[PDB]
Amino acid sequence: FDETEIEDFKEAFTVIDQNADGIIDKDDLRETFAAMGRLNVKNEELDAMIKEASGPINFTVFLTMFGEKLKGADPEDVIMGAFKVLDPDGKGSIKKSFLEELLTTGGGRFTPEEIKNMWAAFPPDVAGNVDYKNICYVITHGEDA
Amino acid sequence: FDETEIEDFKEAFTVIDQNADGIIDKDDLRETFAAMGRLNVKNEELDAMIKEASGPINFTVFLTMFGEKLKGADPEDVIMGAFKVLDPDGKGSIKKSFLEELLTTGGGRFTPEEIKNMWAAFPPDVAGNVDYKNICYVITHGEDA
Amino acid sequence: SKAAADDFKEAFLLFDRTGDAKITASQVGDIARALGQNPTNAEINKILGNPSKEEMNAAAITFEEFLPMLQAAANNKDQGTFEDFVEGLRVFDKEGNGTVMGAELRHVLATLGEKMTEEEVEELMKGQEDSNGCINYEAFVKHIMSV
Amino acid sequence: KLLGGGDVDHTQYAFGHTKVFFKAGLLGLLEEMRDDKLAEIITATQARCRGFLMRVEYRAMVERRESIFCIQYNVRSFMNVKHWPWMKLFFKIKPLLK
């Protein structure tokens, strides 16, 4: 965890903690979702978020919960560092079959089935290994941009 | 309703509510129309807009009235998503007869008569199913661009 | 037999567009395939005619005729041997590697024997043939037998 | 390439530099038997294909299921709305925004 990433989680903690007391309760979760447009947010969704913690969601409990789910989270500059080492001549997005072979043949984390799941929402270019960069974006901030 | 679409309706609510008290009355409707160039806006048009609500037009009454008229409203990125699946090779606008056959033969909402009305203001290319994209524009924002 | 599989009757309610519990004779070929049976279209045609049943005029159905026609087609599933499917395509292209050139398999599947539309041929090659123009039929016939 | 198709005896003939060679009436007889034997072999291999062919159509039909609806309803809106004061207003106005 770099310090600017921890400051981003402190700003997200303050936007969900609308009572500003330092502990995100279930009312803060529901009023942050209602301010984003969720008028139908069920109480069972709020209870499932609170069921991931052993205590109240203060800043260090929110940081330890996000730490334990993001144990391989990598910032965009280090993902582009590794992709610039995979394309060491610069500019070009690397081939689809080169990333499939190098993921498998180096590591068990790069096994195929997982490579079909990589192509599956990370579209073609991303999946193929030709573009580059959009995948670093969606690994640090999810969903389609 | 995505949250940026709800923020667009909040900005349109503030431009029509020129008294800034949170409730669009008939004077706000007339003074917004006069500021757009409508010097002859009749009082019966303002009364027909207010007759679509059961109470005063505050932000949640304006959102529920627009929700109930736009129960199949689709943003431009999801309409272009579906048209990229209809043209999965990219770039090309799809044929006129292919969209007429696939609208009818899949669903009752794609029946012909309705397909003649689709060609009728959505011009040829649009109607035909060759161009693409201008129809996504006019479905999210009406009238000729 | 029931093993009474009552899900065949529940799938007949998903293919009947009128909800009256009848399925036309033109849908019976594709619904036997969707219940896990692959009778050839000439076989589906013969049986029909064999029973003085005309698929040329309007047809209705009842579950009481569709059930025994699915049970008469279910004995013919012993014809689905994958050794002969992969050896057919292995005799269709030279060298010791299972690759059909793209257009060879597309024109043979549309024009040889039971005509498959070129729309269905493109939907069966989509994903298994890459831009080299070579269809690996070891994985292609594996994925065709996955459904 | 042509002879590629047909439930014909791929024996009974023979090619060469200027022409094909073909049997009648024995080799002719052979082939015939052969011909029937592929309908079998073939007819059966056709079926599965046919079968399978449509089996992929269902996977597509189904996928499509909603994307249509989305498209379906979505249009309808507009047809209704585009004639609504408030909506035209939003329209001329939608731009001044940021």
PDB file of C-alpha atoms in Angstrom, chain A residues 19-99:
ATOM      1  CA  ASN A  19     -22.075  11.130   9.770  1.00  0.00           C
ATOM      2  CA  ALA A  20     -18.330  11.981   9.952  1.00  0.00           C
ATOM      3  CA  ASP A  21     -17.723  10.164  13.251  1.00  0.00           C
ATOM      4  CA  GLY A  22     -15.162   7.688  11.930  1.00  0.00           C
ATOM      5  CA  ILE A  23     -17.322   4.539  11.811  1.00  0.00           C
ATOM      6  CA  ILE A  24     -19.345   3.526   8.767  1.00  0.00           C
ATOM      7  CA  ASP A  25     -22.604   2.039   9.984  1.00  0.00           C
ATOM      8  CA  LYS A  26     -25.444   0.553   7.906  1.00  0.00           C
ATOM      9  CA  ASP A  27     -27.211   3.920   7.615  1.00  0.00           C
ATOM     10  CA  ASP A  28     -24.102   5.423   5.998  1.00  0.00           C
ATOM     11  CA  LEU A  29     -23.984   2.584   3.491  1.00  0.00           C
ATOM     12  CA  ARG A  30     -27.642   3.068   2.587  1.00  0.00           C
ATOM     13  CA  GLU A  31     -27.425   6.871   2.351  1.00  0.00           C
ATOM     14  CA  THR A  32     -24.316   6.721   0.183  1.00  0.00           C
ATOM     15  CA  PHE A  33     -26.047   4.273  -2.137  1.00  0.00           C
ATOM     16  CA  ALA A  34     -29.170   6.440  -2.234  1.00  0.00           C
ATOM     17  CA  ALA A  35     -27.022   9.465  -3.134  1.00  0.00           C
ATOM     18  CA  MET A  36     -25.534   7.481  -6.032  1.00  0.00           C
ATOM     19  CA  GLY A  37     -29.014   6.577  -7.313  1.00  0.00           C
ATOM     20  CA  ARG A  38     -29.795   3.350  -5.462  1.00  0.00           C
ATOM     21  CA  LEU A  39     -33.316   3.839  -4.168  1.00  0.00           C
ATOM     22  CA  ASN A  40     -33.917   0.086  -3.979  1.00  0.00           C
ATOM     23  CA  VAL A  41     -30.800  -0.935  -2.007  1.00  0.00           C
ATOM     24  CA  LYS A  42     -31.858  -3.872   0.173  1.00  0.00           C
ATOM     25  CA  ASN A  43     -30.901  -4.202   3.825  1.00  0.00           C
ATOM     26  CA  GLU A  44     -29.453  -7.634   3.118  1.00  0.00           C
ATOM     27  CA  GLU A  45     -26.757  -6.062   0.932  1.00  0.00           C
ATOM     28  CA  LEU A  46     -25.786  -3.737   3.750  1.00  0.00           C
ATOM     29  CA  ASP A  47     -25.772  -6.658   6.170  1.00  0.00           C
ATOM     30  CA  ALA A  48     -23.500  -8.672   3.862  1.00  0.00           C
ATOM     31  CA  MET A  49     -20.985  -5.826   3.768  1.00  0.00           C
ATOM     32  CA  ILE A  50     -21.015  -5.600   7.557  1.00  0.00           C
ATOM     33  CA  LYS A  51     -20.729  -9.410   7.786  1.00  0.00           C
ATOM     34  CA  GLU A  52     -17.279  -9.183   6.178  1.00  0.00           C
ATOM     35  CA  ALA A  53     -15.989  -7.393   9.286  1.00  0.00           C
ATOM     36  CA  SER A  54     -15.631  -8.626  12.851  1.00  0.00           C
ATOM     37  CA  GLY A  55     -16.263  -5.144  14.245  1.00  0.00           C
ATOM     38  CA  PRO A  56     -17.421  -1.644  13.309  1.00  0.00           C
ATOM     39  CA  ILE A  57     -16.040  -0.205  10.075  1.00  0.00           C
ATOM     40  CA  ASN A  58     -13.554   2.393  11.239  1.00  0.00           C
ATOM     41  CA  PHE A  59     -10.647   3.455   9.034  1.00  0.00           C
ATOM     42  CA  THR A  60      -8.279   0.656  10.090  1.00  0.00           C
ATOM     43  CA  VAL A  61     -10.957  -2.033   9.802  1.00  0.00           C
ATOM     44  CA  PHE A  62     -11.772  -0.810   6.313  1.00  0.00           C
ATOM     45  CA  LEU A  63      -8.079  -0.822   5.397  1.00  0.00           C
ATOM     46  CA  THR A  64      -7.519  -4.349   6.707  1.00  0.00           C
ATOM     47  CA  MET A  65     -10.591  -5.669   4.908  1.00  0.00           C
ATOM     48  CA  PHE A  66      -9.453  -4.127   1.626  1.00  0.00           C
ATOM     49  CA  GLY A  67      -5.894  -5.345   2.245  1.00  0.00           C
ATOM     50  CA  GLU A  68      -7.059  -8.937   2.671  1.00  0.00           C
ATOM     51  CA  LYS A  69      -9.101  -8.846  -0.550  1.00  0.00           C
ATOM     52  CA  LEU A  70      -6.471  -6.971  -2.560  1.00  0.00           C
ATOM     53  CA  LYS A  71      -3.384  -9.042  -1.743  1.00  0.00           C
ATOM     54  CA  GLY A  72      -2.222  -8.864  -5.379  1.00  0.00           C
ATOM     55  CA  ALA A  73      -3.482  -5.375  -6.242  1.00  0.00           C
ATOM     56  CA  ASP A  74      -1.058  -3.512  -8.465  1.00  0.00           C
ATOM     57  CA  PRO A  75      -1.026   0.193  -9.335  1.00  0.00           C
ATOM     58  CA  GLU A  76      -1.248   1.197 -12.996  1.00  0.00           C
ATOM     59  CA  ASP A  77       2.370   2.381 -13.208  1.00  0.00           C
ATOM     60  CA  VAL A  78       3.764  -0.988 -12.137  1.00  0.00           C
ATOM     61  CA  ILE A  79       1.463  -2.881 -14.484  1.00  0.00           C
ATOM     62  CA  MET A  80       2.647  -0.651 -17.333  1.00  0.00           C
ATOM     63  CA  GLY A  81       6.211  -1.203 -16.122  1.00  0.00           C
ATOM     64  CA  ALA A  82       5.793  -4.955 -16.586  1.00  0.00           C
ATOM     65  CA  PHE A  83       4.061  -4.491 -19.953  1.00  0.00           C
ATOM     66  CA  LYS A  84       6.899  -2.246 -21.155  1.00  0.00           C
ATOM     67  CA  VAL A  85       9.296  -5.046 -20.271  1.00  0.00           C
ATOM     68  CA  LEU A  86       7.108  -7.423 -22.280  1.00  0.00           C
ATOM     69  CA  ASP A  87       7.172  -4.944 -25.144  1.00  0.00           C
ATOM     70  CA  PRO A  88      10.725  -3.605 -24.732  1.00  0.00           C
ATOM     71  CA  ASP A  89      10.774  -1.753 -28.064  1.00  0.00           C
ATOM     72  CA  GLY A  90       7.878   0.459 -26.962  1.00  0.00           C
ATOM     73  CA  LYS A  91       4.520   1.513 -28.460  1.00  0.00           C
ATOM     74  CA  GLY A  92       3.256  -1.849 -29.765  1.00  0.00           C
ATOM     75  CA  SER A  93       0.648  -3.957 -28.042  1.00  0.00           C
ATOM     76  CA  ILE A  94       1.961  -7.493 -27.689  1.00  0.00           C
ATOM     77  CA  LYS A  95       0.503 -10.550 -29.462  1.00  0.00           C
ATOM     78  CA  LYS A  96      -2.326 -12.692 -28.146  1.00  0.00           C
ATOM     79  CA  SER A  97      -0.468 -15.981 -28.433  1.00  0.00           C
ATOM     80  CA  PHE A  98       2.689 -14.576 -26.863  1.00  0.00           C
ATOM     81  CA  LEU A  99       0.903 -13.652 -23.657  1.00  0.00           C
TER      82      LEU A  99
END
